[PDB]
Design a protein around this ligand. Structure first.
Ligand SMILES: Nc1nc2c(c(=O)[nH]1)N[C@@H](CNc1ccc(C(=O)N[C@@H](CCC(=O)O)C(=O)O)cc1)CN2
Ligand SMILES: [Cl-]
Ligand SMILES: [Cl-]
Ligand SMILES: [Cl-]
Ligand SMILES: [Mg+2]
Ligand SMILES: [Mg+2]
Ligand SMILES: [Mg+2]
Ligand SMILES: [Mg+2]
Length: 159
């Protein structure tokens, strides 16, 4: 099964960080550890080093040479490279989320209370097609710059 995981500012702006949220990074790690992660080449270059404890699959029509990750050229190849696993995590960026959304059955979202200047957005999804099965709000604190709300949604309908 395919899931997307993303952190969204107001207006669904995503980035590679205008905010400083170690709690969100802990949420990201907890929910991706021991699962393959699929990302586009822009996201890969922004991370710079393979995420530990996860198979790192990079979707790009023009692969790099880095032997530390697995390079694939299509959504279908990305999925095949993951093989028989319970859950595949798609970690962005904008275009990769857009291509994978139709195949996804679960969303892990962090809704951040920040207005920011970026131009890359998380895909449009029809809220009526999803059910909110978890939500938790957290205030900002000495370690986290903004307030945020974790949410998990499960797909109920497809169009
Ligand atoms: N919800 C959430 N989802 C996301 C991101 C986020 O920002 N938060 N960011 C996007 C991908 N970018 C990164 C950049 C850095 C890291 C990263 O470095 N993670 C460490 C944890 C951080 C650390 O302890 O050093 C890890 O092992 O997972 C993860 C995703 C995609 N999805
Ligand atoms: Cl957590
Ligand atoms: Cl990308
Ligand atoms: Cl505090
Ligand atoms: Mg090689
Ligand atoms: Mg889009
Ligand atoms: Mg769309
Ligand atoms: Mg319904």
């Amino acid at each position: 099964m395919i899931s997307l995981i993303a952190a969204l500012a107001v207006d669904r702006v995503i980035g590679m960080m205008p905010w400083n949220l170690p709690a969100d990074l802990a949420w990201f790690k907890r929910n991706t550890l021991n699962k393959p992660v699929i990302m586009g080449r822009h996201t890969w270059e922004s991370i710079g080093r393979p995420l530990p404890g996860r198979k790192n699959i990079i979707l790009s029509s023009q692969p790099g040479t880095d032997d530390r990750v697995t390079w694939v050229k299509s959504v279908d190849e990305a999925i095949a490279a993951c093989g028989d696993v319970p859950e595949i995590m798609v970690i962005g960026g904008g275009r990769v989320y857009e291509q994978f959304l139709p195949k996804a059955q679960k969303l892990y979202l962090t809704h951040i209370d920040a207005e920011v200047e970026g131009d890359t957005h998380f895909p449009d999804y029809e809220p009526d097609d999803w059910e909110s099965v978890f939500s938790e709000f957290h205030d900002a604190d000495a370690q986290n710059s903004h307030s945020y709300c974790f949410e998990i949604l499960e797909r109920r309908h497809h169009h």
